[PDB]
């Protein structure tokens, strides 16, 4: 869809619950960066890309 997927971002998402994280850069679909975590149960959670906790979670995953 050519629209922002995250109308609000969620708090309290833990690394242990995350299966994957998708980072989508700005463009025609959305002028803001969007971060969507897919949890181990299949839930999708929109995350604040600016958040220092979100940056820490993604860098922890890369190790």
């Amino acid at each position: 869809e050519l629209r922002c997927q995250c109308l609000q971002t969620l708090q309290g998402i833990h690394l242990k619950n995350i299966q994957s994280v998708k980072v989508k850069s700005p463009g025609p679909h959305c002028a803001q960066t969007e971060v969507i975590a897919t949890l181990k149960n299949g839930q999708k959670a929109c995350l604040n890309p600016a958040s220092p906790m979100v940056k820490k979670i993604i860098e922890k995953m890369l190790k």
């Epitope: 050519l2 629209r3 922002c4 109308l7 463009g27 025609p28 679909h29 959305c30 002028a31 803001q32």
Partner: antibody, heavy 119, light 108 residues
């Protein structure tokens, strides 16, 4: 400091075409969509179509497909809407607007251009 | 296309009154709904986007609510400068479509 400046009012005869410009300033032109909305008597506001200023997407309303063309010029940060095969009923104010975070909402609007079609 | 029904088509209210304007979509638009104010001879101006978010610079007296097919714009304490026509816009499905507008008149 976002500004959208449109070309001045025009008068045209039936069968002519009109090309309205929308010059953008105060933001990165290629990161947003420009949409065209017309305001004709008894019809409130009507979306005509839109295009992504960075390229790749142009969409037209089925009510105007076949006689509307929208174009973009990155070097002048300008978008144009050309409406062809004009009829007296195309008399209306034509607005351009820039998208917000996406093309679902219109964050900034041009001042409008009144186009009158008359013999 | 999605039909947007705005209610009422016109209303009269006094300064300090709370004003409520509703917008109903013919199908679920998933909160891709925005509200605009238009003064006579002027371009529309954004008030609210994604159903509830207030645009930059817009006074806190404006608020939006709703989901699915039903949305509401509220002005908590009407001011003289709120004289205008108000429109809703959906873009949950293309083409985007507008409500017919609500003309807000001031009693004084």
């Amino acid at each position: 400091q976002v500004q959208l400046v449109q070309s001045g009012a025009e008068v045209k005869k039936p069968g002519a075409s009109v090309k309205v410009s929308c010059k953008a300033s105060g933001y990165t032109f290629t990161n947003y969509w420009i949409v065209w909305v017309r305001q004709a008597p008894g019809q409130g506001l009507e979306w005509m179509g839109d295009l992504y200023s960075g390229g790749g997407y142009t969409f037209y309303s089925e009510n105007f497909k076949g006689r509307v063309t929208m174009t973009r010029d990155t070097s002048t940060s300008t978008v144009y809407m050309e409406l062809s095969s004009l009829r007296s009923e195309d008399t209306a104010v034509y607005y351009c607007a820039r998208s917000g975070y996406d093309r679902t909402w219109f964050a900034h609007w041009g001042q409008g251009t009144l186009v009158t079609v008359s013999s | 296309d999605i039909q947007m029904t705005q209610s009422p088509s016109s209303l009269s209210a006094s300064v300090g009154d709370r004003v409520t304007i509703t917008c109903q979509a013919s199908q679920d638009i998933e909160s891709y709904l925005s509200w605009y104010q238009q003064k006579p001879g002027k371009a529309p101006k954004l008030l609210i986007y994604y159903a509830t978010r207030l645009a930059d610079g817009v006074p806190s007296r404006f608020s939006g609510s709703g989901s699915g097919q039903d949305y509401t714009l509220t002005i908590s304490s009407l001011q003289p400068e709120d004289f205008a026509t108000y429109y809703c816009l959906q873009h949950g499905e293309s083409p985007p479509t507008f409500g017919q507008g609500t003309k807000l008149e001031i009693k004084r």
